[PDB]
Amino acid sequence: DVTRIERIGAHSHIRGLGLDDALEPRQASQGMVGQLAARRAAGVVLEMIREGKIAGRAVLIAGQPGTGKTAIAMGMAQALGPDTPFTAIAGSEIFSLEMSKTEALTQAFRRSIGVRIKEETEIIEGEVVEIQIDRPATGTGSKVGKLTLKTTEMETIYDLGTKMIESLTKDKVQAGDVITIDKATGKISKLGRSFTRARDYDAMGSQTKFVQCPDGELQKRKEVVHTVSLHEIDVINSRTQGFLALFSGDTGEIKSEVREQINAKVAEWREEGKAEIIPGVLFIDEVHMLDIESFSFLNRALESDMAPVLIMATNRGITRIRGTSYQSPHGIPIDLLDRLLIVSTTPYSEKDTKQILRIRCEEEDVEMSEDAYTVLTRIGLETSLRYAIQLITAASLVCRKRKGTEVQVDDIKRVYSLFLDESRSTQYMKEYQDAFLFN
Amino acid sequence: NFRRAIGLRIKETKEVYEGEVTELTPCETENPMGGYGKTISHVIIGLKTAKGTKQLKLDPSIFESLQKERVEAGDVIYIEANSGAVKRQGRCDTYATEFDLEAEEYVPLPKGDVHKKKEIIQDVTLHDLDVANARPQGGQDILSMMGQLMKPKKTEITDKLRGEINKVVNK
């Protein structure tokens, strides 16, 4: 019924890697199938990331187009959980106008190491019974007051300080409001009006949804866990009151002196037990986009004790490294390719190509006959896997238009005639050679 | 552009009071509280429009605001019913003749009732939430006002802000 902001997309079916407790890959589990060799290796590097001991480890995932390179990266990103930072970048995204390439990579690294801070404070939480504010007839401005708070079990009176009274009066709290006061911070917050007293009221100053009175003890403790990247700690400290740059992205080329100072202070917090450092992962997809200046930065940037684990993926043969003349493996220079472990991936068979389609129809809510799967699997080897996957929704829609309730083989033959594969498109582009532009 | 092509449709009530102010009548209790000289329980404000007139009864704390704004009888004003704040619009057009020149623009008498309510459906892209959070407005501070005298420029919105907006629109 209801549609949320996240929907069905290209990799929505993957929910882990499907390894057992002995770190062996199951044939089909957690929405991944086949590809046993690379899934084992992904298990080992995931285990290394969770241990957290060793910095700057790098892994490259390689293989043909359309063989689950990105899928395995998403697989481990699910398995690693939400509580541990995992950053995705496509290699194109570092070519900023606001800052240099080495800055952009430094930010992407520092955004991938978390500092985790548990915080507890004491709060008072109650329904406001009354407020008194007394103001001088001329005087210096030394206002004074009293406030009373209620729960279903208890009520009491507070004599109010001069720094605190400005907060109540700023946020215009009044009797009948339910509020939560943080004693240490001196900040008020409001839940809403209690149901009872709004009957005994003037012409309206507010019109909003009510809330129930709090229960039991009037004073209680609260706990929050904050995860803050090293990057946002660098930004906060780059200038006074710089907070908006965490959303705005306006902070350019941060001073090295600031980061050096933060790296020290983070270590002190670790030893003090005030904060936990938690290494995460940086995933650069399509990494062959980087210039050789970017590669040369990675060589030596990867050698710091604050470096995260780095994962890269690519689909490239021996090709010329972007921004130079030189050919090399994966289009990466050997300086960097020597510093990492390569995992490689394998083309699919009938047996697993059919199984991928089966697990995809389960996610898009489709039924098909075994005859239809048989035809579609052939299409998915005559032509690429992504194309076969793309026919499944089109087949379901054409089925539904004609008031069917299960996709039949003639639905698939219909769709297959209507939307082209690249190979067929490129073939028709030969017979109209003069009519298209710039051949 | 990928965030421009996704919309929200969100719907909310507006309520407002408006009219020419005919009276301000601070109302005393029969006796003051102990030791005090006088005590005021409420203010009465009488508002009129092309449809009619009525008294509104208000909390005494309104009176400070009604002298921060230079409200005087024969002005037209409005009150935002969800917030309690009051704003002056100007002298009513009725009085435009009382001098050969005055340095104020007169405004016509409100039409319809003293108290108004409607439901409206407002529609916005996620890109509009991105920008409105990345460069705030309604400044009463050096950061805002400096930021608003300076030439505006687009900026590389961070993936954190996109994250947080996604979290709250889901709620």
């Binding site: 007839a137 | 301000l24 000289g37 329980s41 005494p60």
Partner: peptide
């Protein structure tokens, strides 16, 4: 001597001690 503002279940109240102007003149 202090001007005093009160809000409670019985409704709101503003109060002035005797001899203070209590400057809420009518209009």
């Amino acid at each position: 001597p202090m001007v005093r503002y009160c809000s409670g279940a019985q409704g709101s109240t503003l109060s002035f001690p005797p001899g203070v102007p209590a400057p809420t003149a009518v209009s």
